[PDB]
Structures are given as structure tokens and as C-alpha cells.
Amino acid sequence: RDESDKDGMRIVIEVKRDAVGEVVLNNLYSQTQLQVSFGINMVALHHGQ
Amino acid sequence: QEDVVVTLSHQGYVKYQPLSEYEAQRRGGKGKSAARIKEEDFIDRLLVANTHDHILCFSSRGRVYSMKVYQLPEATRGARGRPIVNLLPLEQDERITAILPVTEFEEGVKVFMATANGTVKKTVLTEFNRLRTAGKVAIKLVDGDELIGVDLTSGEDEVMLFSAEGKVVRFKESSVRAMGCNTTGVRGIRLGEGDKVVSLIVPRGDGAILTATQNGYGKRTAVAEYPTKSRATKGVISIKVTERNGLVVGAVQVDDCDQIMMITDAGTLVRTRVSEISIVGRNTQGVILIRTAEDENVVGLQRVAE
DNA sequence: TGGCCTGCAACGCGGGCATCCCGATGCCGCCGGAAGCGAGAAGAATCATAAGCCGTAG
DNA sequence: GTACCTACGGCTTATGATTCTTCTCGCTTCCGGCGGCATCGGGATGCCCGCGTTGCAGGCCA
């Protein structure tokens, strides 16, 4: 479901009955794009080079 | 690191506590009021290792379980601990045979096993690198076989197999070649009709070998008298079997200052110092240790780890 | 503050010696049962290949 | 009024290939039980004598 409005984004996910939810949440964190890396790379011009 | 000691009780309660607390609780003598309880519980296995090391739980069905030390219940949140059958996936009538603390997965360390049908087997510790709590098959058992003895053998150590008919064999582990985990193994002792292996002792030090019979008769014999024959050959005389003695219950290596545990079919527990037993040779019967009625017999011999 | 350890004198029976019977045992001939080595088969896993988005440019 | 294409560079994820784990075919041959008989060492049974076990009471220890 979804409950987002003009007071803040809110996403609601119904957990299946008879489930801890923490293992499912970890599987999501491992698979869902909620955990992504970042390619830090500091390159710029100092005297045009 | 937190050097702890792991104490497994006779009823199957596993737990551990730090060495400082264990030595503090050990100070003093045991109360004689508790010794009058015939249905009490005592420590079965004792070991000291690191909390980050791995333990190998060996069952009688040929399965081995690998788990960490910190997964066991601590001294807090319960004094007696938790049953081992509720934390390990053990089947019905599946009892734990032996537990071997392992610090490093050394290639030179081998896990020697022995079955009831005389089939022995050793496995390189390297093959036990990655094993979960579910466990795997450590030895292939035939119909009517069970695992009875597991010990770590390496270098030039020897192994000994004990029988109920008074036979015993002693051979070096160099005459055996390792195999896979899902194989049967090699044969180590001659067994007669209806006879099986009862115990295993690896010679370490100068401790004497203490054996016993069903009717409470036992003796002691030094290891310097036991010949060193080949594997799966005829066994030398261990004890004179007689209708007054019965089948051999078991044998455990004991020093001159330790204790032995003797249990009967009724439930009588008897603690006897080893100094009250005469020292005799191999081709002997022994002396009288405890009384025995015409309808009871000793069913278990074990060295007190206290 | 209560119980374990030990000196001591009196009661008690087991250790030591002698011996014939018994059950393990070595040996020999005979029968059988894992085995284990090589070989074949199955499952598990890490390297290699084709974009997709990020924002300007045509 | 609106839609569809690629270059400039990096990580990943969506799928066919190779080393490590495992499942278990083959029987046969040297080897390990298995039974019978002569053999030998132990010991249970009997008697004698001193030492191991135990009760009482005191001083020491957990």
C-alpha cells in the first residue's frame, strides 16, 4: 500500500502472517535498491589539467 | 577470548562459564548431604577452550554437528543450562558420543572414529572446514552399527579397541589411510559372535588402564605390559572372562589420584577411589570392588572428570 | 558456628599360602563379509558477456 | 498538442561455462572371522595370622 501525502512520504508494507519480518527485511536490504554503493571520485582542474 | 569451561551433565544439560567463576565455585568441599541423593546429576564431559573455537558434536548415528561456543547457554539466565536435545537437531534415540574442541583446522590433525562392529575410521580435519549446525554424515553405518568412540589422533599416536569377550588390540594409526567423509572405513579389531567394541583408549602419559565387568569386578594394568600388535589382528588378553564376571562393561585410562564412576541397572551410583584397587597383570580376573546381587549388574564405567 | 580429619583401643575378617577345576587361548583348518580403489555421476560456484542510469552534446 | 537515438565513463545485475563437494557401481582378493582341540594360568575354596575397617573423642578447617 501507500500513504504518502503533503506531510511526508510514507510507504506501508503488510508483513505476511507467521513471519518474523527481520529476515525478510534483511533479504530486502540485500536485494532491494534501498542499499546501494557510491563511486566517490574527486577529479577537477587545477591549472586546466 | 574469555577462557571458559564447558560442562556437560549426565542428563544432557550443556552450559559454560568463565574459568575464574568455575575456580571460585570449585573452592571448598562438596556437601555430603547431596551425596545421599540417588537421582542427582553429575558432570559427564568437561573441556576448556576458547569462545571463538569450534566444537564437533559426534552422535551414535554417524552424524557430526559443528557449532560455535557462544551459541550455548551461559551461566547467566539459568544455572542448570539447557538440554542438548533442544539445541541440536538430534533424532529419536540419538545420543551424543563425544565432543572434540578444535582451535585451528590443522591439516595434520585427524579425527579418529570407532564403531561397534569393529570398523574404525579417521578423517582429515581439513574436510571439516565449513559445516553448519545442520551437520553432515561423518561415517556410513551398516544396519545394526553405531558410533561409540571418537578421538583426535596425529603424529605417532596409537589407538586401542576394547571388547566384551576380553580381547584388546593396539596398533599405530600409520597403517591406516584416510578416506572421504561418506565412506565406511577400515577394520581394527577381531570380534566374535555377538561381541562388539565397548570402549577406546588412546595411550597418553603413564596412566593405568582400569577395566570392569558386569558384576562389579575390575582391575588395573599398566600400559607398559600391553603388546603393540598390528591392526585387525588377534587380541591379547585384557581380562579373564568368567561366568562370575560377565561381559566387559568398559575401560578408561585413569591416574593414581582420580575417581571412577560405576552405575548399575537399578540406578545405584558408587564413587570409588582408584587407590583401593590392586595392581595385577593382564591374564588375571581382578579383585572385589563393589557388592552385586543375583539380579543386577554394572552397566556403565566412566572416569570422574572432577 | 558447624563439620571434616585423625589418634587410639577394641572388634573383625580378609590377605597370604596350597591346590584341582575351569574357561580363555593359541593353533589349524575352513568359511565368509566388508572394502577401497578406481571410476562414473551429480550439484555447487566464480569468471566472462550484453546495458542503464546518472547530464550534456550532436 | 506530443517522441525516439547515441557518445563520453563506472557497478550492478540477467544468464552459459569450469574446480570443489558429493552419490555411490564393480566385484574380488587378500584378509578377517569361526569352530574344534590340546594347553595353561587363575582362582575359588579351606585354614592361619595381623592388618584394613570402623567407633569414640579430640583439635583443626571450610
Side-chain angles (χ1 to χ4, degrees), chain B:
Chain B
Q1 183 178 2
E2 188 66 27
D3 291 331
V4 296
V5 62
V6 176
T7 61
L8 182 63
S9 67
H10 182 74
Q11 293 179 357
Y13 292 165
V14 64
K15 65 182 181 180
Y16 64 93
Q17 64 182 357
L19 190 149
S20 296
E21 184 178 1
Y22 181 75
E23 293 294 328
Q25 293 179 356
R26 179 64 65 192
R27 293 179 293 173
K30 292 181 181 180
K32 292 182 181 179
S33 179
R36 294 179 293 173
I37 297 169
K38 292 181 181 179
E39 293 179 353
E40 65 181 0
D41 192 359
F42 63 93
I43 302 299
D44 192 0
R45 180 66 181 270
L46 189 150
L47 60 89
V48 175
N50 188 358
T51 62
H52 295 285
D53 291 333
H54 296 285
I55 61 170
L56 294 174
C57 294
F58 294 97
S59 66
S60 66
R61 293 182 183 272
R63 294 178 65 88
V64 62
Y65 291 164
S66 179
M67 65 180 288
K68 275 75 70 177
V69 176
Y70 63 91
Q71 292 180 356
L72 294 174
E74 294 179 353
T76 187
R77 293 180 181 177
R80 293 180 181 177
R82 296 291 185 269
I84 193 166
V85 298
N86 296 115
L87 280 73
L88 280 73
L90 293 174
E91 294 293 328
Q92 184 178 2
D93 291 331
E94 183 178 1
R95 66 185 184 273
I96 301 299
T97 299
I99 297 169
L100 294 175
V102 175
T103 300
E104 184 178 1
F105 291 163
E106 182 66 27
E107 294 179 353
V109 176
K110 276 75 69 177
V111 177
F112 182 76
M113 294 182 286
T115 62
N117 59 5
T119 299
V120 297
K121 184 178 179 180
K122 65 182 181 180
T123 301
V124 177
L125 185 63
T126 302
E127 293 179 353
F128 291 164
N129 191 0
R130 292 180 181 177
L131 182 61
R132 294 179 293 173
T133 61
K136 67 184 288 184
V137 176
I139 189 167
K140 185 176 180 180
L141 294 175
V142 298
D143 191 0
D145 192 1
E146 65 182 1
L147 184 63
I148 53 89
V150 178
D151 188 75
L152 293 174
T153 60
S154 66
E156 294 293 328
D157 291 331
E158 293 180 354
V159 297
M160 293 177 69
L161 294 174
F162 293 95
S163 67
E165 293 293 328
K167 298 292 184 182
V168 62
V169 66
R170 184 176 179 179
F171 62 92
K172 293 181 181 180
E173 61 89 20
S174 66
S175 66
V176 175
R177 292 179 292 173
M179 292 177 69
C181 294
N182 290 318
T183 61
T184 302
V186 298
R187 186 175 293 172
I189 190 167
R190 301 290 181 90
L191 296 177
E193 183 178 1
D195 186 74
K196 65 182 181 180
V197 178
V198 297
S199 295
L200 187 149
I201 295 171
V202 174
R204 292 182 180 92
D206 59 356
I209 302 299
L210 190 150
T211 187
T213 61
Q214 292 179 356
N215 295 114
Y217 291 164
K219 68 181 179 67
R220 295 182 295 172
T221 300
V223 298
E225 186 178 1
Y226 291 162
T228 301
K229 299 293 183 182
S230 296
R231 65 179 177 88
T233 61
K234 292 181 181 180
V236 298
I237 299 169
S238 179
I239 190 167
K240 184 177 180 180
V241 176
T242 306
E243 293 179 353
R244 186 178 179 180
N245 297 114
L247 294 175
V248 176
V249 176
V252 64
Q253 184 178 2
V254 67
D255 291 331
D256 291 331
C257 64
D258 292 331
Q259 293 180 356
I260 61 170
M261 185 64 72
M262 294 177 71
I263 190 167
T264 61
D265 59 356
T268 300
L269 294 174
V270 175
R271 292 180 179 91
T272 300
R273 296 290 293 164
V274 298
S275 66
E276 294 293 328
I277 298 168
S278 178
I279 297 169
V280 296
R282 292 183 291 113
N283 191 359
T284 58
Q285 181 177 1
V287 298
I288 298 169
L289 279 72
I290 62 170
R291 294 179 293 173
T292 300
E294 293 179 353
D295 59 356
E296 66 183 1
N297 57 4
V298 176
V299 298
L301 182 63
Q302 184 178 2
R303 182 180 63 83
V304 175
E306 147 207 356

